[PDB]
Design a protein around this ligand. Structure first.
Ligand SMILES: [Mg+2]
Ligand SMILES: [Mg+2]
Ligand SMILES: [Mg+2]
Ligand SMILES: [Mg+2]
Lengths: 360, 369, 369, 369
């Protein structure tokens, strides 16, 4: 027997470590037994997926009055309640969902990964971005990452196909045979140009990541490209996951929690793709300790054999959303083993809540 | 050159005329929450636009998401040329992906301004008057039984010849009200039974089989397109697809499958007049009959609809509707008129509607300079 | 209110600037035959439009067919309101089926009149200035290595970064043509090998195989779409479809198969500016890169091309072309301009072109109200 | 050895025998405009051909298009060997693309010359007399129960066993026409409801469902093939496809989908007797029932029809028609004959018809070697 007694929405700025600021949305849910749950949505750019930072407010102003008095431990009941209140807008339902999972974990005395089936991966592999500099300086920097445990690297591309060809051709002979490189275009290329790129780099082993915006443009690129393809921002739910599997249309599916509509749907999409023997990346768009805690539990419950990587989202910002969260040890991401999400809100960083709903 | 100098967002309550408007699987609205966007320019031309949902869970659209979008978009829209509608379209689409419902009132205001600057009604800029008076339908909502026999004689004498039976809350009694409404129709008349996504697929099939000997239009029996196609395997009745018609991509699927007999085009579900126009033109070029509509709303939303309907070829326009007449309160001064069961657009420049500032009250948001 | 009071048809020869133009399988044009439609109204607004083929066998189109259509339709078009472009389109499609190239000059005259009536350039009415300056290509060229390098450096200095290789008459020496040209281009430059429907399917495959190590655009290698798809099974090069892109129907199946990397849109091949616009918009919403052009012609044909180009998103517009600059004679006064290898539309009301009555001569036909 | 020495184009009015001829969605033909091509040779062998539309908007074909094609192609055909019909076919298709209706009279004239040079009727050159007297239909009637009975009794006694009901202007009263006509004909007889592209897809489906218990032929209910296939989702009646059957490509699509029970073959819609023969032979090899006919016209068009019918296997030939008997005026001297409700081709060399030069008047165009 449990009831939601208070819902608060927090908003804070998260500046990037190398310079520029993402807008965080934290939801804090209180119960009549005094169990507190938190969840976070933070976009990396407002135009990046069908998701923006102000949409959490909007959803909360409609839903939070209807969520008071309900039992947060029942994550799927809360899921169906939210999906009956508004259709879509999953990015905005996502912080609530995570907070409900946090509460269920506290009530059960278990970490969120245990409620997701167990620890199927002890330390999710991680990647390092870039480097975008001199040849001898990239060589020194990749050696620093390599010594520290990293074997995967993300070439950030997608703003100019022609110089992107140069970036890929320059980076790949600078890494060892045991090492992965994903050229992530972030939906950036036009279909003709992505094909020019793929043809120019056909003699190279790298992962071709979300070359174009839509799934169909990506499949058109795939008609020519032999490189293992990774689909990301277009993986928006189970429907898309079903179509990718039916087409066998990717070698890796990247699973971002808030793009999938929260940890509940993200887990179901993951479970679906694992059962179809599709390798996956477990992450989210952006964020601090609260978003990262959800990510780490999500990765820890993914089979080691099918988990490509995850990411330490909290280490990209100079400011915090939460106290605690996941940790990094030797280039691997580790979930908490303490009950719930293993993260509480950082109220000092968050400020006064922008909105507050409570039971009488 | 023209520049956007000011953007204001207004919110008001639009109560329903009959009291309760029962739709779908147990939903009802007593009051709809309107969102009105008002755009001012440096030549003193003012545009306006409206999104109002009929139910906050009806489509991928809710009233609070308009504010959220405007807080993001409106600062970036200031100083832009509002009469370049497709520049404004792609700018709004560069600022945020999706959320077409929220862009829809801005888009309408832009079309309004363009009409004023050209000295032409919005129907002219949409291709001309291809239908003089869109035929109308009268929706009888979810209520009793012996009282719809007088509702028909009311609307029959009023000029209407098309009627919507609201169903979807219980397939079994729904069979009975389809079966009792149809023999009350006259020869030159039509009836659509709208489930508003309400039936579970097996129950929509039971209904289709129990009413197989009847001539009516089966409208959006289930939530998804795939569910409706599953119903269509068994159902011979002309099918009308509505809330699942989200845009051109779905329109392409429907045409490729030849998967409906009517496609319903709700302006804000399509993401504004710009995208609504393009989806309309696509379906007509593929000889698919259409309904020109929006979700709900007052005079500003109804002005857009009327021009949408007026620029649709009459050979392919099933009906349209007078949304402003469903409410006890207003959003705009002006808008379309009705005469003998047909909806007539304004012939004055722009949308032919100005904001009812007295009804709307103080703006909830105001960006300027 | 506006009424068409006079329809006149003009015919004139436009000789090619460099003697003989070789396209496709050995075909040669030295003089192209222009058809110009001039439309008068009761409020003194005059519109004009043009269709000029490159060759008479180049597409489903020929110069004498405009006369034949005008002889049927021009009596029926008198008294109508030319501002209502979609009404005129529907009316023309009602009088005859197909013959889009013949309806195309009328459609351009109607857009011109609408522009003038609204005080806006045709690009505004097509959505806005979405590309300020369309990229252009050079047609070049056929000589020694040093003379090729010199002429390409002058084009490069003139602002050109796109080059068309005229092929299609002989697959075997076309292979060599391609191999000679590419190493003389710089990184980033586009080369299109336009066979103009010229290769037999097996020979096109041989060419694709012998040039698989090369970065160029393979353009319309065969007549039919199916043939081009059969080449596409082997060819990894970006494929541009042109003369087979005849309308929305074909557009839809190119999209469904993801059948090309570029779709080339010739206004008269699509049946006029109204249909061309709609096919453009469909392809752009499906994120297909496009070329905005026409078959051939003087200033009147070129004015429509430039507005069509200017209202295409810069992101997806591959190139356009300055058709008027290929001829020694004129159909119109005014038209588009060329600046630093880019094609610019006019910003004055309408198409921004008036008929060159002295060059055109006496009308071959005249219908008055 | 033989050479074309002279080509002449004639134009004449063919008034309809019964005043006005109501077809499709609100069309009427009172006078049809014939185009007759006359080809002379150096051995004194003369051939003639004809194209006459049944309404200018009926198919992708109009009367003025023959003139336009001729003006471009006829100077290029002088000196050529007209007996080599495939060489002439391929030359025409090289000179212009499409416009097969305009090529059709030239094609007929070449088959005429070949039959004369070989001393054999055209049916012999198309494979033989595979049907001795093609079965005919009567387009009757359109009136009262007392008057339909007397009219079907005179038609029955005259040998007729197949009846076309002209519908497609009002689906609702077309239901009633079908329902009132079918029980007024005996066991052996047949009836086809030809909507002539006239119904909208939703209305065609309503008609199909209302008459789902009845034995008739659903002919061309909607314009496009895809619209017709959508109707066919619901309609179990034998479907007859007509105007959309434009050539072999569409015949291949139809065969692949098995998308009709009868294919109607109009010579001029297929681009002439040569393409018409190839499309028929392809469909017969795929065991598709066919109708062998043409759009409209006098004795010259009807001569080609009768030879087309006579060389169609009788197991698969549904019917043919006596086109010459629909008009009050002539294009030719001779042509086919009618006996006991069957259409009979001539057995004399060539088409069996000469041009009625007196009815045709002065040549509108004249090309000489
Ligand atoms: Mg990615
Ligand atoms: Mg509906
Ligand atoms: Mg080309
Ligand atoms: Mg027929």
């Amino acid at each position: 027997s449990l009831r939601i007694t208070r819902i608060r929405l927090y908003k804070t700025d998260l500046p990037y470590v190398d310079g520029t600021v993402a807008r965080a949305s934290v939801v804090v849910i209180d119960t009549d037994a005094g169990l507190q749950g938190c969840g976070e949505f933070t976009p990396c750019g407002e135009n990046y997926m069908i998701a923006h930072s102000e949409g959490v407010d909007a959803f909360a102003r409609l839903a939070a009055p209807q969520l008071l008095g309900q039992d947060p431990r029942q994550v799927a009941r809360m899921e169906r309640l939210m999906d009956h209140l508004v259709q879509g807008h999953g990015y905005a339902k996502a912080p609530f969902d995570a907070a409900f999972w946090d509460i269920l974990g506290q009530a059960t005395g278990q970490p969120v990964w245990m409620l997701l089936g167990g620890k199927l991966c002890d330390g999710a592999p991680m990647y390092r971005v870039a480097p975008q500099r001199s040849e001898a300086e990239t060589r020194a920097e990749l050696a620093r990452h390599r010594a520290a445990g990293y074997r995967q690297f993300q070439i950030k591309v997608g703003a100019d196909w022609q110089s992107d060809i140069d970036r890929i051709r320059a980076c790949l002979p600078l890494l060892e045979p045991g090492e992965k490189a994903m050229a992530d275009a972030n939906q950036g290329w036009r279909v003709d140009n992505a094909i020019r790129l793929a043809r120019a780099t056909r003699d190279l082993d790298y992962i071709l990541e979300q070359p174009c915006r839509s799934y169909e443009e990506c499949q058109q690129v795939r008609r020519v490209a032999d490189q293992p393809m990774k689909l990301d921002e277009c993986v928006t739910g189970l429907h898309m996951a079903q179509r990718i599997v039916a087409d066998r249309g990717a070698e890796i599916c990247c699973l971002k929690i808030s793009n999938l509509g929260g940890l509940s749907k993200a887990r179901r999409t993951r479970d679906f793709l694992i059962d179809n023997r599709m390798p996956v990346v477990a992450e989210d768009s952006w964020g601090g300790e609260i978003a990262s805690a959800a990510v780490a539990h999500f990765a820890a419950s993914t089979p080691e054999e099918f988990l490509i990587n995850s990411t330490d989202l909290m280490n990209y910002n100079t400011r915090s959303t939460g106290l605690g969260g996941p940790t990094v040890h030797q280039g691997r991401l580790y979930a908490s083993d303490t009950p719930g999400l293993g993260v509480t809100p950082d109220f000092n960083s968050l400020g006064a809540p922008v909105a507050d709903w409570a039971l009488p």
